[PDB]
Amino acid sequence: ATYLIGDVHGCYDELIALLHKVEFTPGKDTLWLTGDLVARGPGSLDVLRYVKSLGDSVRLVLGNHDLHLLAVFAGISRNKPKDRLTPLLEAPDADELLNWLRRQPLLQIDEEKKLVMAHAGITPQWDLQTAKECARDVEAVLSSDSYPFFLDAMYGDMPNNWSPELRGLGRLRFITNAFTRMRFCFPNGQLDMYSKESPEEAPAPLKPWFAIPGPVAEEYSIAFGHWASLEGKGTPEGIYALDTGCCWGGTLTCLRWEDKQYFVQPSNR
Ligand SMILES: [Mn+2]
Ligand SMILES: [Mn+2]
C-alpha cells in the first residue's frame, strides 16, 4: 500500500502511532512524507533516525524547516530555541543524519500513480519538465560539498516571478521558495512570500497556488504539506493538503493512495 503523511515536525510518537494504525510494513508498503520532519515538536532526532532507516520504503521531499536545520548545522543560521533542535544537533550521529537529509529530493514523481509531491506544492508557473529541472539543480547544490554556500544564498523573498531566463542567486532563491515556502499567488502566478493566513482570510487579490490552473496540476495529482493554516481542507479535486498541524495541537494525517482513505492521529500536545 501507499501512505502519504503530512508535516511531522518532530512528532515522533504520533507518527509511529499513525503508522501502527495502518500497519505500515516496509517491503509491502511505501511511505511518502511531505517534509518538515523536524522542529517545533520534541522528537526531531527520533524522526530523522527512523525515516533514514526506512531507505527505499520512504519517499521524502525536503521542507523549509528541514533546510533551516541544515543551515543551523552548517553554521549559516542561528539556532532558534523554539525549534527544539538541540538534541538532534548534539547527537553523536548528527553528521550521518544530516548528510543523509541534505541528499533527499525536493520533488517526488510517480508516473503510474500520476502523483507529484513537493513540500509546498507546484507553482502554476511551472510545467513538469521545469519542475524536474529546478528540483535537480537545487538537489545538486544541497548534495555537494559546497552546500553551506547555497544554504546561505537561499534566504530571500525575491525574485517572486518565474522566468526561464532567471540565472544565479535569484534562480536558486525562487526555486527554493516555490518548493518549500509557497502558499499564495497573485493572479499571474507570482509568489506572495508574506501571507500565511487561510485562503478565506488572505487579502485580495491573493489566491492559493492551487486555485490557479497550472500544467502540472492539470495532468497530475499533487500532494503537499507546509500550509497548516489550510487545515488540509478547501482544495480542488486532485490536490491533497496533508499538513493538518500536528505539532501545533492539530492532527497528523495519513492518506492511503489506493482507496484515498484517510487515517488521523490526534496531537499529544
Ligand atoms: Mn513547511
Ligand atoms: Mn510545516
Curated annotation (Swiss-Prot):
Q: Name one Pfam family in it.
A: Metallophos
Keywords, A to Z, come to: Hydrolase
Catalytic reactions of this protein: P(1),P(4)-bis(5'-adenosyl) tetraphosphate + H2O = 2 ADP + 2 H(+)
At the top level of its lineage, which domain of life is listed? Bacteria
Q: What is its EC class?
A: hydrolase
**Which SUPFAM superfamilies does the UniProt entry name for this protein?**
Metallo-dependent phosphatases
The regulatory note on its activity is: Co(2+) is a strong stimulator (100-fold increase in rate of hydrolysis). Mn(2+), Cd(2+), Ni(2+), Mg(2+) and Ca(2+) are weak stimulators; the two latter act synergistically with Co(2+).
Residue intervals passing through the bilayer: none
GO: which molecular function terms? bis(5'-nucleosyl)-tetraphosphatase (symmetrical) activity; bis(5'-nucleosyl)-tetraphosphatase activity; hydrolase activity; phosphatase activity
The keyword Hydrolase belongs to this UniProt entry's keyword annotation: yes
Q: What is its EC number?
A: 3.6.1.41
| GO cellular component terms, semicolon-separated | cytoplasm
Q: Which InterPro entries match?
A: ApaH, Calcineurin-like_PHP_ApaH, Metallo-depent_PP-like
Q: Which GO terms describe its biological process?
A: nucleobase-containing small molecule interconversion; response to X-ray; RNA decapping
What family does this belong to? Belongs to the Ap4A hydrolase family.
Function summary:
Hydrolyzes diadenosine 5',5'''-P1,P4-tetraphosphate to yield ADP.
Q: What is its quaternary makeup?
A: Monomer.
Which protein is depicted? Bis(5'-nucleosyl)-tetraphosphatase [symmetrical]
Identify the gene encoding this protein: apaH
